[PDB]
Amino acid sequence: TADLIFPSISASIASAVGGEIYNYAGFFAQYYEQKPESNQYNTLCEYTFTESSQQMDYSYRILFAGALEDAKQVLEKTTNPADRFATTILRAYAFQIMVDNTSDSPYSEALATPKWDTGETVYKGILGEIDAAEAALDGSGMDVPDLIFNKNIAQWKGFANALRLRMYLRFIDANIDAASYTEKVKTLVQNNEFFTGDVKLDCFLDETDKRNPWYNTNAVGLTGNHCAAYPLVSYLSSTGDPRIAYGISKTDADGKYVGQLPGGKTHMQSILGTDNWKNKNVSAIDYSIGATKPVYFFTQAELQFLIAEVYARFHNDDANAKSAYEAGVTADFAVRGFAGQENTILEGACAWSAASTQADKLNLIYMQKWVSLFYMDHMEAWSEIRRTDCPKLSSYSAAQIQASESVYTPGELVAPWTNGLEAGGLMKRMTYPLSARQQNVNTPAGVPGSTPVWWDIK
C-alpha cells in the first residue's frame, strides 16, 4: 500500500544524499580530507578513483531501485493529489541528485537497458512534473505518513519552490533559456512561498541500523577517516567564525585548528616527515555530533542565500539581498548551536556593509552558503561550487601554499596536491555507476572527472 511505501522514498534518498554521496561531495567541496594515519579516502582526496572504484554504485541503486521505484508505486496507488504532490517532489529531487552527479540520467525510460537522458532533459521534465502535480492540488489534506513535513502542504509547496529556485538558477548560469528562467526566478522570490525550518529527515538514533548514514559508515563501520581541509579551516579561522568549533576538533598535538591541503596527505608526510604529520597534527572531523544528526535535503540557510543571490543579481535590490544574506547566516548559526552569535561575522569580517561591488556581495553570499552547507548537505555544496565557481579556485598550487601560506586567500579552493585528473583542476562530476556499465549497454561512455555536467559551462 502507498502508506507503507511512501516513507521509504525519503529514507532511501537520505541514505544516498546524506551518506555515500554526502561523503565524497565533502571532499570535492573541500570541507575535509584524509586523516594522515589511514587510507580509506585517499582516492577521493587525490582524484584517483575510477569508474571501477564504484564510488556511487550503492547510491545509484538506492536512488533508482529504491527511492524512485517506491515513488512509482505510490503514484500508482493513490489518487490523493497532495500525496502525489509530495511524492513527485521527492521523485524530482532524486533525479536532481543523479543529474548533478553524472549529468545524464535514466528518466523517460527509467523504471532493462534504459537510455540515459541528458540532464537538461531531466531537469525540464521533473520541473514540469512538479508544476503539473501542484496544479492538481484540490485543497484536501495528505494521507501518507510524512516524517519530512508532517503532512503540511504549504511546506511541501515551499520545498517545490526551493527546488525550482535551485534548478532555475542552474539553467540561468548554463545560459539555457536564461532570460525566461531569470523572470521565473524573480517571481518565485517575490512570491516568497518557500519552506520554513529545514527540509530534513530527522529520525536517526544512536542505535544499531538507526544512525545517520554518514556517521554509521565512517564512525561505526570504520574508524574516523576525516580530518578538516585547509580551505574551510582557513576561511573560518580568518573570518573569526565561532562555527569553527562545530564538527571540527582542535588538534591533539597543540590544540589548534589545522586543515590539511586537499590531496596533500602523502606530501605533508614526505615534506615534514611521516612522524611529524600524524592524526594529532591535523584537526579531526568531530563525529560526536553525527550519530543522530538529520539528513538535509534543503537547508533554510541555503534557501536564504539563493534568495539573496536572486535579489543581488536580478532585482538590483540591495536591501532585500542584505536581509536574506543575514537571514541565511543567522539560520545556520542557530542550527549549529550558536544562536545570537551571528553578528560576530555579520558585523565583522563578513558584514554586508563591508562589501562594495556586486562581486564582493556575491562572494559573501557564496562563501557563506558554502560554510553553511558543511556538515549539512555536501552534495549541494559541491553543486553550488560548480555552478557559481565560488569559493574560487586558488591561483596557487597546494605545494606553493604549503611552502608560503601568505600567497593563499583564505577560503579559496585548492586543486588536490596529488590529482589523478589528467587535466588537473577540480572534480566536475562522478563516474557512471559500474553496475550501469555492466548491465546497461546504453550507459554513456565514461569521461574524465574533469568533464562537467550539462549545467556547468564555465
List of residues contacting Ca ion (CB under 5 A)? 386, 389, 456, 458
275 labelled ligand-binding: no
Residue closer to Ca ion, measured from CB, 56 or 385: 385
65 labelled ligand-binding: yes
Q: How far is the CB of 426 from Ca ion (least distance, A)?
A: 9
Closest-approach residue to Ca ion (CB): 389
Q: 559551462: which residue's cell?
A: 457
Question: Shortest CA distance to 146 belongs to which of 346, 309, 49, 7?
Answer: 7
What end-to-end distance do the CA atoms of the chain give, in Å? 46
386 labelled ligand-binding: yes
Residue closer to Ca ion, measured from CB, 256 or 458: 458
- DSSP class per residue in 96-162: HHHHHHHS-EE-TT----PPEEPHHHHHHHHHHHHHHHHHT--SPPP-S--TTTTT-HHHHHHHHHH
Q: How far is the CB of 458 from Ca ion (least distance, A)?
A: 5
Q: How far is the CB of 389 from Ca ion (least distance, A)?
A: 4
d(CA 384, CA 456): 10
* Cβ within 8 Å of residue 266, ≥6 positions away: 418
d(CA 256, CA 79): 57
φ and ψ at residue 295, rounded to 5 degrees: -100, 125
The last residues before gaps in the chain (C-N over 2.5 Å) are 111
Q: How far is the CB of 297 from Ca ion (least distance, A)?
A: 23
Q: How far is the CB of 175 from Ca ion (least distance, A)?
A: 12
Question: Shortest CA distance to 13 belongs to which of 202, 299, 295?
Answer: 295
Residue closer to Ca ion, measured from CB, 210 or 458: 458
Question: Shortest CA distance to 169 belongs to which of 154, 155, 189?
Answer: 189
Residues for the chain: how many in total? 458
Residue closer to Ca ion, measured from CB, 302 or 456: 456
Residue closer to Ca ion, measured from CB, 170 or 386: 386
Residue closer to Ca ion, measured from CB, 412 or 456: 456
| Exposed/middle/buried for residue 444 (C-beta within 10 Å: 0-12, 13-18, 19+) | middle
Q: How far is the CB of 418 from Ca ion (least distance, A)?
A: 23
Q: Are 103 and 91 in contact (CB under 8 A)?
A: no
Q: How far is the CB of 167 from Ca ion (least distance, A)?
A: 16
d(CA 70, CA 91): 9
DSSP assigned state of 413: B
Residue closer to Ca ion, measured from CB, 293 or 386: 386
d(CA 81, CA 25): 34
293 labelled ligand-binding: no
| Exposed/middle/buried for residue 23 (C-beta within 10 Å: 0-12, 13-18, 19+) | buried
Residue closer to Ca ion, measured from CB, 329 or 427: 427
Q: How far is the CB of 430 from Ca ion (least distance, A)?
A: 15
d(CA 130, CA 84): 10
Q: Are 399 and 417 in contact (CB under 8 A)?
A: yes
Residue closer to Ca ion, measured from CB, 391 or 416: 391
84 labelled ligand-binding: no
Q: How far is the CB of 455 from Ca ion (least distance, A)?
A: 9
- Give binding residues for Ca(2+) as ranges: 386, 389, 456, 458
- Give binding residues for Mg(2+) as ranges: 65, 70, 386, 389, 456, 458
